[PDB]
């Protein structure tokens, strides 16, 4: 990634072997949890496109998901190249050329060019754009990987309300929806697909009640 | 997180994977207990709000408590923006914007803004307030996760006194009761809900019995 | 813990994750033994009172021993406040106030107070006093945690002599007493509860002999 | 590996034991996987040829693959020496001699020679050439180690479609071919060896459709 | 232990918890091999007597060996007090007092006195003498631990010569003898208790032969 | 061992327990293989002779190889003191004594003398010579530990070719044969001691077969 030395100039540090060891390990160990995506955001803070590509390719298995995310990367690069024109000519000092889709993807770029593009003034967030594309691809793969839909979860006769709401939130984290409508599901379906006793309890308590008090009422 | 060098000037540092690996493991290994709050408070000392958000997002399971702490953060931010109004419209040159309800948590604020806020002169303890809010949320959570109340704790006919008093102090530590009422009840409810023979022995020993005397007498 | 080193002494670093993780893991695995006393003393060499509080709060389980340690610390703090009264009236400017009985435990004090009290000229060893308090508490804990007394140790017909004396010395170390009677009790109890073969061997050797000759005598 | 940093660049540090241990573990545990080439490229980022030799010598087992790698490296070094002949006669003073074909592999060179070659002005990237040789050898190794060809892959009546396409893409990644034939062969081979139900589904969808719709079509 | 900072003055650094963790784990896991004492020498390089005392006390179990080493320490301290007189009077700056056996052992001394004694000119190797006493005690313990004597090992009819000589040297590392006589032992007992066929082979080859050629002849 | 600081001046550092534990695990884990000599050469790079002595003394088991390496060290020291006579009797002021046969290994020499020798101007590579001697000793050890000669390798009727060629190259690398004779025999013994059907198939290809062809043709 990129680090700043104590009272020194901006220098580029190599990839973290211990972090990569953890990243490969986490996927195998954790299977494919939704929390894995944040994991990538925390482990790849300020990482270069080459480091991101190495971290993606070093993963063993999930080749179908890798092909899907590569297709999404190609589509995003094509959209970027279509929305932003490309100009050619002499390169003036202090100003870099127009990055293309393949240059943002990092497949036809080099480490020195990436450093020059990320250390310019103003900086070009090529790494940030690639990381956003990667996390969007991971969100798509975790949406497709969801075994149970958001509208298919219902509280059973013997299933506790704690486990019910836990699974409901786990499916909501993996479902596809916008941020505004995201509250509508957890406000309506959470009480519309519960056990009838706690349904009546929450209806008598009030719909505007919060999760803590509604659970303390459903537990008692 | 934040480290202090021998020179005197501090810089930003990315989140180390070892701390989060331990944090994910400690939450899973220890489940939920009173000891998790201190570990959390000692492990995330001097960290940016984004690091705490990632730690609260990288946890696997128990999404109910995560939603509880998220709603607690939202309520605290609402109370903060209600009690602290923005009376100053324009911003002086060289000064950064005041942290609002959504900026104090790091939802719509980048890491550079948090760095500039925490490194100001004088510094703005946004991370400290966020840690206090998370500690209050965890207190509420461990109070909800109590298996039973303090009044229902009664020693059985053949159950030993060691595990009995252990469970008693365990369910008393997670209680939101004040120090005064806890010190008042620990002198009465411990002897009133004990083994009859031991209870009579402790009552005949005197009204100034301490912990070690009770442990030595109740086991004989 | 506080760090006294080269220029730049005005530094304070929190507890390292490796230390705290190791202490919680070792205490649970080793349960309670006389051995923990030196491990705790070595892990907390020159630590701040808040660090000791965090280390005492990180332990999970055994709430009775923790309550006994807390009440012993409170009693010793009350004794210290009784023997070292605080002076009334206004304090002199530039002179730090002496630590009170409750300030040693770190319950009503802050970080800057203990930092100024430890880095004062001359320094005030409040951390050493708190460590001695915790050591006395752990001594009382390991004394009350003794399952079998020292007099109920008798070697069986098939139990080895080495294992017998190992158990005997472990039980003797678990209990705290004056060494002047220990020198007599070890000699008047070791050579009395051995096997008949080892008993006649030590009788033919001599009571005033050393221990290594007794170990190498009845071996095998 | 080479360390290019602030003043004091003239420094050579050996390979860290942790990275070498991680390499040994990932070689022993996973044998050879299509993802080992990015692992080697990340763990050996900017290393001296001696470091590459030490990493290639610590491999456990699979002597045939190592011999294949060695002979490929020798052949490519011979080709480099043939295409880049060395100039005869005396060398100019102060100008470092060009590395020979055998000097790149580090079989007849020393540490100071390659240090001066990599730190010259302009630098000579012999380490990158050796890494290219090693990754080409690894590609040949993973192509030879292919247990089943790409045409002998047929999905059974009960095997899932996701695992089938995962195995297919894994076998395709294990083999190295031109980019202009792979996009045609995958489309002409995937929609033929699927389940009858999934075959009818994809026939109802369309040949020129994307892969995500094929994955989400016959799911469950 | 004692360390020297880069371009700094000689300062005493605190003890490392990981060292004690490795030390407690290795002794329990490896029981009492002769190499354990050597391991001790590497872990206690330049450590203060308090560090060695804590390391010995933190060991779980084996209180008999602890009592034996404490008795040896007391005997060595008494011998040092008898051979070196003790003087009293005013302490001049720059010169330390006469170290007593109780001060060499470190049971009745503090940290600052030992620091001043080890950082004086000329330095008084109190820690080195204590470490020598401790390794002598460990040698005595590992000699007592030896189940089979050096003269009781004989090669069986089906036992190979490799394991035979391995066990022979393992027992020789645990017997009580000086190096001058240890050479004669490892020269004559190796051929006196060997296999008769290999005995005749070595007699035909020659007694002055080294172990390598003797083993290569006995294998064939 | 020996580390290089950013300033430029190097200092002495004690052996880290992690490297010693890793070496012990590798020795315990893999017994003896031709691949452990590069592991030792890369793990103990730039270490004092005392560190190598401690590493060779802390190993548990296989004392025959330890005695072999000790005898080789003694023989090399004898050859050194025989070929390098001490012609200079007096020692110049400021100059250290010349390392003798017993001083080059560290038996009767302290660590300070070794530090002064390795930090001289010009430095005396005593550690490098000791490492070369240990490498030669380990070479002799792995040559002796060869199960059989190179001629006894014969592929059976049902034994596969992969494990056959793997064992062949293993015992060839463990052999003391020179680089020329190894390349001379690897073209003959591999084809003359194979499965008859495969043997004839490979002989029908020609005298210019490569390793990949031998692997792909024999398996058909």
TrEMBL record, chains A, B, C, D, E, F:
Q: Keywords for this entry?
A: Capsid protein, Host cell membrane, Host cytoplasm, Host membrane, Host nucleus, Lipoprotein, Membrane, Myristate, Phosphoprotein, RNA-binding, Viral nucleoprotein, Virion
Q: Where is the Retroviral nucleocapsid Gag protein p24 C-terminal domain?
A: 144-217
**Would I find Phosphoprotein among this entry's keywords?**
yes
GO CC annotations on file: host cell cytoplasm; host cell nucleus; host cell plasma membrane; viral nucleocapsid
Q: How does it sit in the bilayer?
A: Lipid-anchor
Q: Which residues form a coiled coil?
A: none
Does the record bear Membrane in its keywords? yes
Kindly list the places in or outside the cell where this protein is found, as annotated in its UniProt entry.
Host cell membrane; Host cytoplasm; Host nucleus; Virion
Q: Which GO terms describe its molecular function?
A: RNA binding
> Pfam families attached here?
Gag_p24, Gag_p24_C
The GO annotation for biological process reads:
viral translational frameshifting
Query: What name has this protein been given in UniProt?
Result: Gag protein
Query: What is the scientific name of the source organism?
Result: Human immunodeficiency virus type 1 (HIV-1)
The organism's lineage is: Viruses, Riboviria, Pararnavirae, Artverviricota, Revtraviricetes
């Amino acid at each position: 990634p990129i680090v700043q030395n104590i009272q020194g100039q901006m220098v580029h540090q190599a990839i973290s072997p211990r972090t990569l060891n953890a990243w490969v390990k986490v996927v195998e160990e954790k299977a494919f949890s939704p929390e894995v995506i944040p994991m990538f955001s925390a482990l790849s803070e300020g990482a270069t496109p080459q480091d991101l590509n190495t971290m993606l390719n070093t993963v063993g298995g999930h080749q179908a998901a890798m092909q899907m995310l590569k297709e999404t990367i190609n589509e995003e690069a094509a959209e970027w190249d279509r929305v932003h024109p490309v100009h050619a000519g002499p390169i003036e000092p202090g100003q870099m050329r127009e990055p293309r889709g393949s240059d943002i993807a990092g497949t036809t770029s080099t480490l020195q060019e990436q450093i020059g593009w990320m250390t310019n003034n103003p900086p070009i967030p090529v790494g940030e754009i690639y990381k956003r594309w990667i996390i969007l691809g991971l969100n798509k793969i975790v949406r497709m990987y969801s075994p149970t839909s958001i509208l298919d979860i219902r509280q059973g006769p013997k299933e506790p309300f704690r486990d019910y709401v836990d699974r409901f939130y786990k499916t909501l984290r993996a479902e596809q929806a916008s941020q505004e409508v995201k509250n509508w599901m957890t406000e309506t379906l959470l009480v519309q697909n519960a056990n009838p006793d706690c349904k009546t309890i929450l209806k008598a308590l009030g719909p505007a009640a919060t999760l803590e008090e509604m659970m303390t009422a459903c537990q008692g």
